[PDB]
Amino acid sequence: LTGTGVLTESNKKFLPFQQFGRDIADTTDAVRDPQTLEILDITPCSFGGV
Amino acid sequence: YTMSLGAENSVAYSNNSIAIPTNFTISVTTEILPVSMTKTSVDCTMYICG
Ligand SMILES: *[C@@H]1O[C@H](CO)[C@@H](O[C@@H]2O[C@H](CO)[C@@H](O)[C@H](O)[C@H]2NC(C)=O)[C@H](O)[C@H]1NC(C)=O
Ligand SMILES: *[C@@H]1O[C@H](CO)[C@@H](O)[C@H](O)[C@H]1NC(C)=O
């Protein structure tokens, strides 16, 4: 899963069998680290009309 | 059912009959209009090309 974003700790629990989660946009919105099984949110990098 | 068009009312017409109001009600009929759409703007290259 290649992409760009702001990784943070996340509060919402995955069930043990889940590997990652999605926005309604189908774009990923949270992930498990495959080495240490903690859940990270993937917030978008900040943007706006200059 | 076949819908009602409202109650029927044969108006009590004649060449010499008038109905004049003895009394009134003031009434405060609310009317609602939209005015501003939500101000969307889209970065079409971030939408299309990520
Ligand atoms: C005109 O209509 C109003 C109601 O819309 C009447 O006012 C009421 O009068 C009774 C006594 O007759 C009171 O007990 C009510 O409290 C009044 N209602 C309100 C909202 O104040 C009024 O009397 C009528 N007047 C005539 C001359 O027909
Ligand atoms: C793999 O990563 C975890 C921590 O993410 C670590 O505990 C483990 O020791 C690593 N594997 C090896 C062979 O060191």
From Swiss-Prot, chain A:
Function summary: Attaches the virion to the cell membrane by interacting with host receptor, initiating the infection. The major receptor is host ACE2. When S2/S2' has been cleaved, binding to the receptor triggers direct fusion at the cell membrane. When S2/S2' has not been cleaved, binding to the receptor results in internalization of the virus by endocytosis using host TFRC and GRM2 and leading to fusion of the virion membrane with the host endosomal membrane. Alternatively, may use NRP1/NRP2 and integrin as entry receptors.
Residue span relative to the full protein: 546 to 595 of 1273
Subunit record text: Binds to host ACE2. RBD also interacts with the N-linked glycan on 'Asn-90' of ACE2. Cleavage of S generates a polybasic C-terminal sequence on S1 that binds to host Neuropilin-1 (NRP1) and Neuropilin-2 (NRP2) receptors. Interacts with host integrin alpha-5/beta-1 (ITGA5:ITGB1) and with ACE2 in complex with integrin alpha-5/beta-1 (ITGA5:ITGB1). May interact via cytoplasmic c-terminus with M protein. May interact (via N-terminus) with host bilirubin and biliverdin, thereby preventing antibody binding to the SARS-CoV-2 spike NTD via an allosteric mechanism.
Protein name, UniProt field: Spike protein S1
Species assigned in the record: Severe acute respiratory syndrome coronavirus 2 (2019-nCoV)
